[PDB]
Amino acid sequence: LLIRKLPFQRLVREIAQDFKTDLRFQSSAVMALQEACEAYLVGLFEDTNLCAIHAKRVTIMPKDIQLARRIRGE
Amino acid sequence: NIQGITKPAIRRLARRGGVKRISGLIYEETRGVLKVFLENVIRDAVTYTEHAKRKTVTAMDVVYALKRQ
Amino acid sequence: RDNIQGITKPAIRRLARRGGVKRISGLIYEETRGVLKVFLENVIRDAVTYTEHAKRKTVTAMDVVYALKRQGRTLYGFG
Amino acid sequence: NIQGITKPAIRRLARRGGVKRISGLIYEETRGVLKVFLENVIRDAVTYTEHAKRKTVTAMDVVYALKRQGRTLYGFG
Amino acid sequence: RDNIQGITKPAIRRLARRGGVKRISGLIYEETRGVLKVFLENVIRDAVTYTEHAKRKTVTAMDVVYALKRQGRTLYGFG
Amino acid sequence: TRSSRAGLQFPVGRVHRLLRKGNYSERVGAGAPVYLAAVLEYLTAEILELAGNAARDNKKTRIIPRHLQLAIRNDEELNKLLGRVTIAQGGVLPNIQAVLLP
Amino acid sequence: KTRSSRAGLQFPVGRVHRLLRKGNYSERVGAGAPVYLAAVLEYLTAEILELAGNAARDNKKTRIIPRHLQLAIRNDEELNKLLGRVTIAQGGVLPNIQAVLLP
Amino acid sequence: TRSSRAGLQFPVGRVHRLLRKGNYSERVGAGAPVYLAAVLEYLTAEILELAGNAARDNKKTRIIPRHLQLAIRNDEELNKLLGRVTIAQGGVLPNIQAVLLP
Amino acid sequence: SRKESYSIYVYKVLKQVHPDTGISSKAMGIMNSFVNDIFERIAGEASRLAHYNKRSTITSREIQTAVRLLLPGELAKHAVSEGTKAVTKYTS
Amino acid sequence: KESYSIYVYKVLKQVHPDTGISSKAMGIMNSFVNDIFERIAGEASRLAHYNKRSTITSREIQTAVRLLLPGELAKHAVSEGTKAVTKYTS
Amino acid sequence: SRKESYSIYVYKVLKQVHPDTGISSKAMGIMNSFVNDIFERIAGEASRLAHYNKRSTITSREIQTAVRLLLPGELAKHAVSEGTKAVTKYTS
Amino acid sequence: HRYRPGTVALREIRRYQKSTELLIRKLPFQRLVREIAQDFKTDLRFQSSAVMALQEACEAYLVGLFEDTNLCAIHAKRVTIMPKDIQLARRIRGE
Amino acid sequence: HRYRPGTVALREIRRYQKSTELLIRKLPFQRLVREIAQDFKTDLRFQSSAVMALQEACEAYLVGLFEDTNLCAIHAKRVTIMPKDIQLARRIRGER
Amino acid sequence: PHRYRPGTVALREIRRYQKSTELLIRKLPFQRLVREIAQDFKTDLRFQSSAVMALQEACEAYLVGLFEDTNLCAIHAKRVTIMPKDIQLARRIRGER
DNA sequence: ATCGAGAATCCCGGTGCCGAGGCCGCTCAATTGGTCGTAGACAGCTCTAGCACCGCTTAAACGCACGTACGCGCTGTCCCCCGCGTTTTAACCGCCAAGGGGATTACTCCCTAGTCTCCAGGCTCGAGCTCAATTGGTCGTAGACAGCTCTAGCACCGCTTAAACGCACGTACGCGCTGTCCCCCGCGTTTTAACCGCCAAGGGGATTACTCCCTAGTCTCCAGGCACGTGTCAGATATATACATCCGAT
DNA sequence: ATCGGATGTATATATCTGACACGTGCCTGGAGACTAGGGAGTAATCCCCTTGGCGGTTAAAACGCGGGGGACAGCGCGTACGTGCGTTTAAGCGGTGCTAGAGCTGTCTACGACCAATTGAGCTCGAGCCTGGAGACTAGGGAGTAATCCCCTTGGCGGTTAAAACGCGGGGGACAGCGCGTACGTGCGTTTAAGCGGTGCTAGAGCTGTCTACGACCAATTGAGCGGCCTCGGCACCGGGATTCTCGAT
- DSSP string over B22-60: E-TTHHHHHHHHHHHHHHHHHHHHHHHHHHTT-SEE-HH
Q: Which of N51, N30, N64, N54 is nearest to E7 (CA)?
A: N30
Residues of chain C in contact with residue F83, where contact means CB-CB under 8 angstroms, are none
As a whole number of angstroms, the distance between CA K6 and CA J60 comes to 29
Domains of chain C in sequence order: 1-79 (1.10.20.10)
Cα dihedral sign for K45, K51, K52, K53? positive
Question: What's the reported resolution, in angstroms, to a tenth?
Answer: 5.2
CB-based burial of residue J12 (10 Å sphere; 0-12 exposed, 13-18 middle, 19+ buried)?
A: buried
Q: Does N80 contact strand O, using a CB cutoff of 7 Å?
A: yes
Q: What secondary structure does DSSP assign to L28-82, as a single string?
A: HHHHHHHHHHHTT-TT-EE-HHHHHHHHHHHHHHHHHHHHHHHHHHHHTT-SEE-
Please list, in sequence order, all residues whose beta carbon lies within 8 angstroms of the beta carbon of residue D7, skipping any fewer than 6 positions away: D27
Q: Which of J39, C36, B18 lies closest to D72 in space, CA to CA?
A: J39
Q: Does domain N1-97 have CATH number 1.10.20.10?
A: yes
- Residue I6: how many CA atoms within 13 Å on its side-chain side? 27
Q: Measured at the alpha carbon of residue I61, what is the angle toward residues I57 and I64, in degrees to the nearest 5?
A: 130
| Residue F69: other Cβ atoms inside 10 A | 24
User: What single-letter amino acid sits at I77?
Assistant: K
Q: In Å, what is the CA distance from E30 to each residue of E17, N55, N56, N86?
A: 17, 20, 19, 14
Enumerate residues 6+ apart whose C-beta is below 8 A from K42: H36, H39, K63, K66, K67, K70
Give dist(CA L21, CA L35) in Å, integer: 24
- Using alpha carbons, list the distances in angstroms from residue L80 to D25, E26, E72, G97: 11, 30, 34, 14
For helices H32-57 and K60-70, angle between their N-to-C axes, nearest 10 degrees: 40
Phi-psi label, residue D69: left if phi above 0, alpha if psi -120 to 50, beta otherwise: alpha
Q: Which helix (H) or strand (E) holds E74?
A: strand E74-76
Question: Using CB atoms and an 8 Å cut-off, which of residues 5-64 of chain K contact chain G?
Answer: 47, 51
Give CA–CA dist J85/J80, Å, rounded: 9
Separation CA M53–CA C67 (nearest Å): 11
- The DSSP code for B4 is G
Rg (CA), chain F: 18
Which among K82, K91, K40 has a CA at the least distance from the CA of K64? K82
Which spans in chain H are helix H? Answer: 2-6, 12-21, 32-57, 65-73, 76-81
Chain C residue numbers touching I23 (CB-CB < 8 A): none
3-state SS track over N47-90: ECHHHHHHHHHHHHHHHHHHHHHHHHHHHHCCCCEECHHHHHHH
Residue among E53, E56, E63, E71 with most chain J CBs within 10 A, to mutate = E53
- How far is D38 from D32, CA to CA, in rounded Å? 10
H55 close to H62: Cβ distance less than 8 angstroms: yes
Q: Report the CATH fold assignment for M1-96.
A: Histone, subunit A (1.10.20)
Most M CBs within 10 A among C7, C41, C44, C57, hence the mutation to make, goes to C44
Rounded to whole angstroms, the distance from the CA of residue G98 to the C1' of nucleotide P41 is: 58
Contact between C39 and M55 under an 8 Å Cβ cutoff? The reply is no
For E65, name the nearest residue in chain J, comparing CA atoms only: J50
Residue C24, beta-bridge partner list? M81
Per the DSSP assignment, residues forming a β-bridge with C23 are M80
Distances (CA, A) of B47 to A10, B51, G94, I62: 20, 6, 48, 11
- Note the maximum CA span of chain L: 55
Domains of chain I: 1-92 (1.10.20.10)
Tell me the residue length of chain M: 96
**β-strands J20-21, G63-64 pairing:** parallel
- Tell me which residue in K52, K62, K68 faces D64 most closely, judged by beta carbons: K52
Whether M35 contacts chain C with CB within 8 A: yes
What is the CATH number for H81? Answer: 1.10.20.10
Look up residue L17 and give its DSSP letter. Answer: H
Breaks (C-N over 2.5 A) in chain K follow: none
Alpha carbon F72 to its chain's center: 9
Please give the Cα distance from C13 to C6 (Å, whole number): 13
Q: Which of N17, A11, D67 is nearest to E10 (CA)?
A: N17
From chain K, pick out residues whose CB is under 8 angstroms from the CB of G24. Answer: 47, 51
Q: Which of E22, E51, E61 has its CB closest to that of N10?
A: E22
Residues in contact with A43: Cβ distance below 8 Å, sequence separation at least 6, in sequence order:
B17
Helix axes M7-18, C9-18, angle to 10 degrees: 70
Contact F88 C77 (CB under 8 A): yes
- Count the residues in chain E: 79
How far apart are alpha carbons I54 and F101 in whole angstroms? 59
Residue pairs spanning C and I at CB distance below 8 A: 17
Could you give the CA distance from residue F50 to residue M3 in angstroms, rounded to a whole number?
39
Q: What is the largest CA-CA distance in chain I?
A: 49
Length of chain H: 102
* CB of J30 within 7 Å of some strand P atom: no
Q: What is the distance in angstroms between the CA of the first residue and the CA of the last residue of chain H?
A: 62
One CATH from 3.50.50.60, 1.20.1560.10, 1.10.10.10, 1.10.20.10 for A1-74: 1.10.20.10
Segments making up each domain of chain N, as ranges: 1-97
Q: What is the dihedral of CA K27, K31, K36, K38, to 10 degrees?
A: 130
Would you call C74 and F91 a contact, using CB atoms and an 8 Å cutoff?
A: no
Q: How many domains does chain H have?
A: 1
Range of the domain at H29: 1-102
Q: Do A11 and B38 touch (CB under 8 A)?
A: yes
Burial class (CB in 10 A: 0-12, 13-18, 19+), F26: exposed
- What is the Cα gyration radius of chain J? 15
Tell me, what DSSP letter sits at residue G11? S
Assign domain L1-95 to a CATH class. mainly alpha
